[PDB]
Every structure is written in C-alpha cells, then in structure tokens.
C-alpha cells in the first residue's frame, strides 16, 4: 500500500511545526490508533 | 562621525628596547590589517596577533584576513607609526617582507603566512606574549596554486579514511613556485571550507548540466584526428572509451549561462587583485605599486 | 571555434555564416573566422579544450563528490542538486588527485574569456560620433 512518490531522493527536514507539516509517527502509535478506532463504534416496528 | 582619516597613528603603549626600533624602522612600505580605523589607536589590533586561535584555522586565518583593512606604514619615529590607508589607484611603493620572489606586470594579494617556524626565523618584534606577524604579500599564481590547494584538500577529504588523508597532506603541501619551497601551515577541515565546497560542488553540477552535446564531446572528437602531448597528457585523466543536432541560437544561451557557471566556481580561489606592480627594484625587496587597497 | 573539427558538412557553413554576424545598433557588422585551412589555432584549440575537459570532468566526478556529502548535507538544496545529476545520468586516489588539479589548471588556463574588467564609462558623447568623455576605471 505504499505510494508512488514523484521525486526520487528523500529530503532532509529540519522545520519546525509552525512552518509544515509532518507524518513522522511510527507503526506503534499506529497500532494503538488501530485498537482505538476499530473498538469505538426493525421487525418489531411490523410486530 | 569624521570620515575615513587618512592617518591612522599607532602608539606602542609598552617600553621598548633600541633594537626592536631598529627592526621597527626596516619594516616601514609595508602592509598591516588594521580591523578598527581610528586615529589613535593602540598595537593590539595591529597585526595579525589578535587572530592566532588555537586552532589557527588557515581557511578560517584566509577569510578573515580579507575582511581586515590593508594599511600601509610610513614614518617610523619614537612610539609613533604613521599608518597610511590606502586610496583607489594612486601610486605608492611596498616593501614585501616573506621571501617570495617578485616580478614585473603581475598582480598581488594579501595572504596568512607560510611555513610558519622558528626555523624561518622571523625577526618579528618579541614582546610581551605578542609577535608582530604580517600578512605575506604573494603574487597570483601562487595565490591561485595555495587556494586551489586548499579546496583539493577540502573535497578530497570526504568519506575516507585517517591514512590516506594523511598520505595526501604528506604529498599536496610541497609548492615549488619559482625555486622556492614553501609548506601549508596546519591545514584543518573546518565550516568555511565546507561551505566553500558545498558551492563548489553545487556550481561543478551546474556545469555538468548546462553543458551541451558538442561541448563535452569536442574533446572526443579531437582525439580521433589531431594528436599532440596536451592531449594525451589529458585524454589519459579522461576516461577511456556527423553532429546529430545543432541549433547555435540554444548553444549561445548555454554558454550565456556556462560562462556565469565558470565564474561563480573560479571565484572561490581567484580571490581579489590588491596590488599589481608596475616596475621593481633588482634585489627584489620593494617595489613600485598601483592600485593600493 | 567549437565547430572547427566538424566544418566539413554543409549545414553547418550555414550555422556558422548565422553566427559570423552580430547585431547591434544599425551595426550589421561580421567577424573574420578563428579556422584557417580546415584546422583551429592552436590558441583557440586551448580555450575550446579548457571548456571541453572541464565539461568532461564536472558530468564524471561532481556525482561522486555529490554523493559523499550527500551524508553531511545539512540544508534543502543539495539533495535536489544530486537528484538533478541522477537524473542526467540516465581507483587509487592519486588520479582523483589528478583530476581535481587538472580540473582547477584547466579552470586556470581559461580566465581570459570569462570575464571582462569595465575599464571606461561614457559620460557624454561629441556630436557627430566621433569622440566621449569618459571616467577611467580599474
């Protein structure tokens, strides 16, 4: 499921939140977000 | 505030002997960096002393040195030295004080000294924990072979080991420019070199992009038909192994920008011309100069 | 000068009867050609190798040196400038040491025509065209 990036080189960060914004969250945090978010969510009305 | 005074008066506040006035008064035509431009000033900013760190970063000594003001010295009296500053064009004789032979019609720049020993043995005014050190006058060819030097160094010292950097200092120091020898004093890496490398390197890829099909094939070309010793002292640094299009209103845009390419590389080493002598004398002490500062 | 070895097809006597001509103001004024007989002067055929061998050797190590401080690169603009070289592009250190000097003699052998000191300024012209004054400069 990865995506198809157009340039080739990774860059090199060195910005502070106020200016951009990044996705720099590892698997674990993920994983926990994947616990948190799959867990939290008539006839008799003819009868 | 006043302007830029034409005068600047040096007064040793120490004692002194007769013969450091006597080594004092040999050293008049020659040149100081001066970093305040007042009227009075002391001799603790005079020279170069201020500058030794402990370190002494001979890139980081360079780009300093050119930030400094180039002053030149007259009327060496009792605890009084007249310090001319220059003006743009006129006249005046300099007396070099490094033994780097000069000649007729070249050009001249300011530079930190070389082979820096007591085996050289400056006579440089000893005195109270503070030497005197000039800066050497060095025509450009010399200037240009130390700088392009320097930068060898610089690039050639990334991502390998602590011997062959080694092996590469023992071989690049020796210069040999007109019979004389003369070594790198303490080459070390340091931020300015690597930001004059990281330009270098980024203006050496502009090159190797704005380059065109012929201009990097005219060489291959000339080495089918004509042969001579500048090539094949040059094809074996290359490497070893009917145009197809040409539209000369593209190519004089390319070399437009090649020609600005060349420039802002050969502008890290080329540094700035501050004096170029007209004629000299025969035992190559002064000489006769335009263009002061 | 560039195009003294390839003089023998017949499109490019028109390229170079096109580039023998400049224009300036009601000035549609030529210039002699730098070949004679077929074959460049040596001074033209010094300044046009300059150009060539320092081409030759920015498109073959500027990508190695590039990719050794790729790892020190500490701002936004080197990693685009290799990304540039790599997509153009699609040993003992005693001939790296070589190279870099015969790139930087190369470099030295060409600052004549880089470049040009402005030496006078116009201030005002005569009359009829004939003479100006101008300030001299370095």
């Given at each position: 499921?990865?995506?198809?990036?157009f340039?080739?080189?990774?860059?090199?960060?060195?910005?502070?939140?106020?200016?951009?914004?990044?996705?720099?969250?590892?698997?674990?945090?993920?994983?926990?977000?994947?616990?948190?978010?799959?867990?939290?969510?008539?006839?008799?009305?003819?009868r | 505030?006043?302007?830029?005074?034409?005068?600047?008066?040096?007064?040793?506040?120490?004692?002194l002997?007769?013969a450091?006035?006597?080594?004092?008064?040999?050293?008049?035509?020659?040149?100081?960096?001066?970093?305040?431009?007042?009227?009075?000033?002391?001799?603790?900013?005079?020279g170069?002393?201020?500058?030794?760190?402990?370190?002494?970063?001979?890139?980081?000594?360079?780009?300093?040195?050119?930030?400094?003001?180039?002053?030149?010295?007259?009327?060496?009296?009792?605890?009084?030295?007249?310090?001319?500053?220059?003006?743009?064009?006129?006249?005046?004789?300099?007396?070099?004080t490094?033994?780097?032979?000069?000649?007729?019609?070249?050009?001249?720049?300011?530079?930190?000294?070389?082979?820096?020993?007591?085996?050289?043995?400056?006579?440089?005014?000893?005195?109270?924990?503070?030497?005197?050190?000039?800066?050497?006058?060095?025509?450009?060819?010399?200037?240009?072979?130390?700088?392009?030097?320097?930068?060898?160094?610089?690039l050639?010292?990334?991502?390998?080991?602590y011997?062959?950097?080694?092996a590469?200092?023992?071989?690049?120091?020796?210069?040999?420019?007109?019979?004389?020898?003369?070594?790198?004093?303490?080459?070390?890496?340091?931020?300015?070199?690597?930001?004059?490398?990281?330009?270098?390197?980024?203006?050496?890829?502009?090159?190797?992009?704005?380059?065109?099909?012929?201009?990097?094939?005219?060489?291959?070309?000339?080495?089918?038909?004509?042969?001579?010793?500048?090539?094949?002292?040059?094809?074996?640094?290359?490497?070893?192994?009917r145009?197809?299009?040409?539209?000369?209103?593209?190519?004089?845009?390319?070399?437009?920008?090649?020609?600005?390419?060349?420039?802002?590389?050969?502008?890290?080493?080329?540094?700035?011309?501050?004096?170029?002598?007209?004629?000299?004398?025969?035992?190559?002490?002064?000489?006769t100069?335009?263009?002061?500062? | 000068?560039?195009?003294?070895?390839?003089?023998?097809?017949?499109?490019?006597?028109?390229?170079?009867?096109?580039?023998?001509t400049?224009?300036?103001?009601?000035?549609?004024?030529?210039?002699?050609?730098?070949?004679?007989?077929?074959?460049?002067?040596?001074?033209?055929?010094?300044?046009?190798?300059?150009?060539?061998?320092?081409?030759?050797?920015?498109?073959?190590?500027?990508?190695?040196?590039?990719?050794?401080?790729?790892?020190?690169?500490?701002?936004?603009?080197?990693?685009?400038?290799?990304?540039?070289?790599?997509?153009?592009?699609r040993?003992?250190?005693?001939?790296?040491?070589?190279?870099?000097?015969?790139?930087?003699?190369?470099?030295?052998?060409?600052?004549?025509?880089?470049?040009?000191?402005?030496?006078?300024?116009?201030?005002?012209?005569?009359?009829?065209?004939?003479?100006?004054?101008?300030?001299?400069?370095?």
């Open positions: 499921s990865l995506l198809h990036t340039w080739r080189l990774p860059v090199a960060v060195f910005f502070e939140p106020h200016e951009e914004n990044v996705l720099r969250c590892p698997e674990r945090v993920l994983r926990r977000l994947l616990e948190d978010a799959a867990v939290t969510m008539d006839r008799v009305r003819k | 505030m006043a302007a830029m005074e034409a005068n600047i008066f040096c007064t040793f506040d120490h004692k002997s007769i450091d006035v006597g080594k004092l008064t040999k050293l008049v035509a020659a040149v100081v960096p001066i970093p305040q431009r007042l009227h009075l000033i002391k001799h603790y900013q005079l170069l002393h201020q500058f030794v760190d402990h370190t002494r970063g001979y890139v980081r000594l360079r780009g300093l040195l050119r930030n400094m003001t180039l002053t030149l010295m007259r009327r060496v009296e009792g605890n009084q030295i007249l310090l001319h500053v220059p003006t743009h064009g006129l006249l005046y004789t300099v007396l070099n490094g033994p780097v032979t000069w000649e007729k019609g070249d050009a001249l720049c300011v530079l930190p000294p070389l082979f820096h020993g007591p085996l050289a043995r400056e006579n440089l005014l000893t005195l109270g924990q503070w030497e005197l050190v000039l800066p050497w006058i060095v025509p450009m060819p010399l200037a240009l072979e130390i700088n392009q030097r320097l930068l060898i160094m610089g050639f010292s990334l991502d390998r080991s011997e062959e950097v080694k590469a200092v023992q071989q690049l120091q020796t210069i040999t420019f007109r019979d004389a020898t003369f070594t790198i004093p303490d080459p070390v890496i340091d931020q300015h070199l690597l930001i004059d490398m990281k330009t270098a390197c980024l203006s050496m890829s502009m090159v190797a992009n704005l380059a065109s099909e012929l201009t990097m094939t005219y060489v291959r070309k000339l080495a089918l038909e004509d042969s001579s010793m500048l090539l094949v002292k040059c094809q074996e640094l290359l490497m070893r192994l145009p197809q299009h040409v539209s000369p209103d593209d190519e004089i845009a390319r070399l437009s920008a090649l020609f600005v390419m060349l420039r802002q590389l050969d502008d890290l080493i080329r540094e700035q011309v501050v004096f170029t002598v007209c004629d000299v004398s025969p035992d190559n002490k002064s000489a100069c335009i263009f002061k500062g | 000068g560039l195009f003294s070895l390839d003089r023998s097809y017949e499109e490019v006597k028109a390229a170079v009867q096109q580039l023998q400049i224009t300036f103001r009601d000035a549609t004024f030529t210039i002699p050609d730098p070949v004679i007989d077929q074959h460049l002067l040596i001074d033209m055929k010094t300044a046009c190798l300059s150009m060539s061998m320092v081409a030759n050797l920015a498109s073959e190590l500027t990508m190695t040196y590039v990719r050794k401080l790729a790892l020190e690169d500490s701002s936004m603009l080197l990693v685009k400038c290799q990304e540039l070289l790599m997509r153009l592009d040993v003992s250190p005693d001939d790296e040491i070589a190279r870099l000097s015969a790139l930087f003699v190369m470099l030295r052998q060409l600052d004549d025509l880089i470049r040009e000191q402005v030496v006078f300024t116009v201030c005002d012209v005569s009359p009829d065209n004939k003479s100006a004054t101008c300030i001299f400069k370095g």
